[PDB]
């Protein structure tokens, strides 16, 4: 029924008002009609009723319902990108004098505003290894606020053992905000709120929009942690624009049929590459042998498109441009989950940097590719030609 | 030249295209063509090259180019709205221990995110009354960071003389970071950078998109800021959609002829309502007798169309419930610079809350007015009427 | 109450806004019925403004023909794609083959063309007569006209039409006929066509009513009359503009009041500059003494727009013409206008006796056609200024 | 190479995109001109690709056209503002006073209207034929035969012309016939018309190119022969459509491949399992063997979309089609089709006899047009299931 739900997802009539899809309600001024209507407005200005732009308008409104109803949530916040609800939702949760428990798999930029921005803050903030599990609670302290996690973790795809990660942060410090960048998952094929995880953080960027042509971050939360977010994102004046919350609720409809593609296609290649005389390992969590796989098979209910694998040499430069600068039909550029293949290159040293308290275990340079709607067939020529460049 | 400034501003082929406006690139993914073109992308990501969503596609460009020719600026940042253009600045320059100094005026959502957010991470937040000058010395701190001014005042609409405040200021603190909410003046009826202010702060959901639907915050900032607000605001996952970037823009080429008319309208309106006898006061800066006038003829080139009027006696709720929903062309609503008239009330004890170590200097009801596009004389008529109902 | 009134409210009632200041934007082709019953409700009103079917429209139309038929006092308002299809989809709307086309000389050229090239392979004949023929338009009557095609002030030589003395003339001989007129010009405001006896008026949304030269749209105001006819046939050809194009039409409406003043304001200031220069043989505005049918002008319009031409005492050769328009600083080369933007042509007198069928052009030198944005009048006077300098 | 390679990439060139992933959306009536040398190289190559005025279309407008010559495989692409308009205009500028039209009886009802109320005052007349007349539709021409129009599968009815026998048997006659055919159902891509012969490829785009109804657009694909005629016509008559619309649609085709799949997967397990049930008189899917043509889509095919028919063993009255219609909790009703959610729709026997000119039906129950989305098929099934309840 997930297909149905997509397809049904915030579509009410009092906010399609006939149409199929909601209508775009472009507004920062909400009239109210007498003094009634406004004290009314004014009651219930966090809970859908009109009372001004920054709030939102019925097109906001339309998706933060589906959101819910897709996340399990008991709410759900918007802000203009996903590095906006990063921040924003870490910042809602501290003050001064926390510690703030992040994975060192984590997307760059969220590791980033930790140590530049949190810390003159005094919040102090140290890493851990992705497949630590139980093991987190050597790594815990009496002032730990926040521990956020991210799976797979980004450009190496390390799969976390949530359960047992959550298990031994309730029972040392039951007070903490568990977060989860969720993006990979589309939120959907890891259902974090169903985990006892507390809020469940999105890049609607990738999958959700689809097209590459839209930013936007949402964070769903838990009936406990819902109102503090809520309120302090909003002092924060986080909001994201009426068209863009259109355009990720339209995106919520093929987000099965894409989804579905991507997965068939992504696995074809990589066990493709698992193969290949080239490769030295593939990092995709619906691989057998990947870090975690074991955990992405009982936890997540499916796979998306994005993963990466490690050559057997370290290309220079003339190599690195003779392999990348060649492709026909992979395209390089950041960001990804649109309808288009990807490809982007790291260097070992790269990662290393941005690995806080950790240690790579790789030589060889290391690919990450997104396996977009095109012919699969196409896509591996593509590729296989690429080897033979470097060969 | 102002309005031959206006029309052309950001306009450049680059941008257009052939186009009379910029183009509308949507994107998140920006293509590199070749490893080269990623390198080169990357070393000018904060100087106009395409880079990533997320930094800005050409329609941002074309905006930020327009803002910093039109206040005089190095640089121009983009935010969601007003509201997080106010936090994410103050944000980006404090740390744990400094002070921040606020004028009493400012607008009640800045006051709130000083009193509840800034206060949790360590920076602490006194307020000065906005007739003050050079007397403000007696507030300045050691550790002031930061010195954030508001001219009119948010409500009540008083004029700080900016020129004695910022020689006091630099006299004490000479580091500290001068800032200005400028939305009334729509950035380019003051001046304030010419003035050593240091960021020049607009929400551009008023005056400049002037139609009421759209939201979006501006930071238009001299030499010595503009990279720490830049980078900072950046890693906070501050950006603006494009369509909203576009719309800004076209509002801009219309703010002249706007402006012109607000002017006029609210100013005859004012001077009616000065001679009413159910009036008690009318503060509108361009109106002498009003607090901070003398500031405002010498430092403007010109007025918008909100202020506001006390009347002799409070209102009861009865009374205000008759006056105010039986206007005809006057509508209630929050936000203002749009092409429609709006009104709104406000009750002595309401405005004391929000004037923090300062006191109020009046006893009959507020009304707050934007005065829009709308015939003149059919807006007396309905004001006029507004006063029979309370007589 | 007051124009400026009008224009800030028509069309704003809250069944369209919902609570906001402007209209919803309604994207849609499937409008779903809730019942059977909701279906037959719905089909029965389709064309009343009931949510029906996308080509019919959604909420967003609605809400821009109410604008419309406020604005100009018509019974119904029909929507094109653009001017260009609102004038040809009219005219096809009226006429069967045999019918004989009567429309000034004066006419947008692509009008014309529609009428030479489209028209004459269905049956349909085209004669053609002067701006200010008046109550002599008679003579060019037949027993078998059916439209009468008015457009005042003309395109790109500006003559105003004496539209009393032809319409009583018109009705004395043919009743029945459809007289339309193409009142882009005057916004359909400046200038209240179905006060005077034109069954419909027609504007290229796109110029005045949009005003940042960023959408095209066409509009048809008809009268009481004509409306069901127009608006049928028009459907039949599938004729519809989308939703997005009409909420920013309806966004123009706003500022149409403080914008057009600008623009009158500003061109009379550089007509009147430009009557005094010595490179000047003739200042075609219609605001202007002396000026083909001024006197008309000042007469039945409430006002003027920034659109207006001059013509040089010397006929420029290629080079003089590149020199001229190639070194401008705030005046651009583009077609169309109504944005906020200055704008220049030039037109030598053999192009445009060309275009003017059954007529003789009554100048020699170089014709430039001018749009005063709303940049600094006096800005604009030095950039022109500077181009007779080009020529001396 | 492949579908689902194209479908990814088509129009996608730097020219468009400016190193974006999709095309840039570039809003404009007006387009600048830099010199006189510009306007020169401009308006020759206005019809080109070369940036001249709005009403010709602009950067995004130019991407989609190349996109959808690539799709096709035309030697151009006119744009329209919706599917109806596509085909009226289409016909308009082939036809002459004195022409003759032969349409499929099975034609979408407005473009039937269209011949009969708008062609026939233009001294045009119209004849019809039946879907399955194959090689006899000899016996149909008339030696002013100007266009022969096909729609394959039928509008409602769904049957598939033998389109090989009818343009062969319609060359060896009329050799300079323009044959056009309504290729909504195929979306352009499940039937490559071009291929066959034919002329041009008409497409209410609104349909599975949009794939989310909230945009209305139609386009018309020529081959070299009919391209600058269709081009020029349907420009004198202003037709275009707006940019963002373009843009939209051009968005649309890079999930067509996934979601054509779907829909043709998900409305042939619905279709098999209606054929077995006991009240169901016949299935009307081209997919489905004994369906009428099922052997031509077979053969000439390379898909099926999510739309078909089915007919009840008893004809419905009001009462029982309310309560049918009127408690379903996943199908919608609503006109149009081609989206992501399951649409439903009944039609009388008399309702389609009034529309089968020159033709009579084969059929007595209640028909009931389905549109099935990207739903879940097994929650679909269960839907009409308990709709079969309410009826035994």
């Given at each position: 029924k997930l297909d149905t739900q997509l397809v049904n997802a915030g579509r009410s009539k009092k906010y399609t008002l006939g149409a199929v899809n909601s209508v775009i309600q472009r507004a920062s001024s909400l009239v109210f009609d007498s003094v009634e209507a406004k004290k009314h407005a004014t009651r219930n200005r966090a809970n859908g009723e009109l009372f001004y732009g920054r709030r939102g308008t019925l097109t906001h409104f339309s998706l933060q319902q589906a959101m819910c109803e897709l996340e399990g949530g008991a709410?759900?916040?918007?802000?203009?990108?996903?590095?906006?609800?990063?921040?924003?939702?870490?910042?809602?949760?501290?003050?001064?004098?926390?510690?703030?428990?992040?994975?060192?798999?984590?997307?760059?930029?969220?590791?980033?505003?930790?140590?530049?921005?949190?810390?003159?803050?005094?919040?102090?903030?140290?890493?851990?290894?992705?497949?630590?599990?139980?093991?987190?609670?050597?790594?815990?302290?009496?002032?730990?606020?926040?521990?956020?996690?991210?799976?797979?973790?980004?450009?190496?795809?390390?799969?976390?053992?949530?359960?047992?990660?959550?298990?031994?942060?309730?029972?040392?410090?039951?007070?903490?905000?568990?977060?989860?960048?969720?993006?990979?998952?589309?939120?959907?094929?890891?259902?974090?709120?169903?985990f006892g995880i507390d809020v469940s953080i999105q890049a609607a960027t990738k999958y959700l929009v689809g097209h590459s042509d839209a930013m936007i971050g949402t964070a769903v939360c838990n009936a406990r942690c819902w109102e503090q977010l809520r309120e302090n994102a909003y002092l924060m004046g986080q909001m994201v624009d009426a068209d863009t919350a259109y355009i990720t609720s339209r995106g919520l409809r093929t987000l099965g049929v894409r989804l579905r593609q991507h997965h068939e296609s992504s696995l074809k290649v990589a066990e493709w590459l698992a193969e290949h005389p080239q490769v030295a390992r593939v990092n995709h969590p619906a691989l057998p042998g990947s870090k975690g796989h074991e955990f992405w098979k009982r936890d997540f209910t499916g796979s998306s498109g994005l993963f990466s694998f490690v050559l057997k040499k370290k290309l220079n430069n003339e190599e690195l441009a003779n392999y990348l600068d060649n492709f026909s039909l992979f395209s390089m550029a950041y960001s990804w989950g649109g309808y288009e293949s990807l490809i982007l290159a790291n260097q070992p040293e790269h990662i290393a940097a941005i690995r806080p308290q950790g240690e790579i275990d790789f030589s060889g340079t290391l690919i990450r590719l997104h396996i977009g709607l095109e012919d699969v067939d196409d896509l591996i020529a593509d590729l296989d030609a690429g080897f033979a460049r470097i060969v």
């Open positions: 709410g759900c916040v918007l802000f203009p990108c996903g590095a906006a609800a990063v921040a924003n939702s870490i910042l809602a949760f501290i003050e001064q004098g926390d510690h703030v428990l992040m994975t060192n798999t984590a997307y760059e930029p969220s590791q980033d505003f930790c140590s530049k921005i949190l810390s003159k803050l005094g919040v102090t903030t140290s890493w851990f290894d992705p497949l630590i599990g139980a093991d987190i609670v050597k790594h815990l302290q009496p002032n730990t606020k926040i521990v956020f996690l991210e799976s797979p973790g980004s450009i190496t795809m390390e799969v976390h053992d949530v359960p047992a990660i959550v298990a031994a942060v309730r029972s040392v410090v039951p007070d903490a905000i568990i977060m989860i960048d969720n993006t990979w998952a589309a939120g959907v094929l890891f259902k974090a709120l169903d």
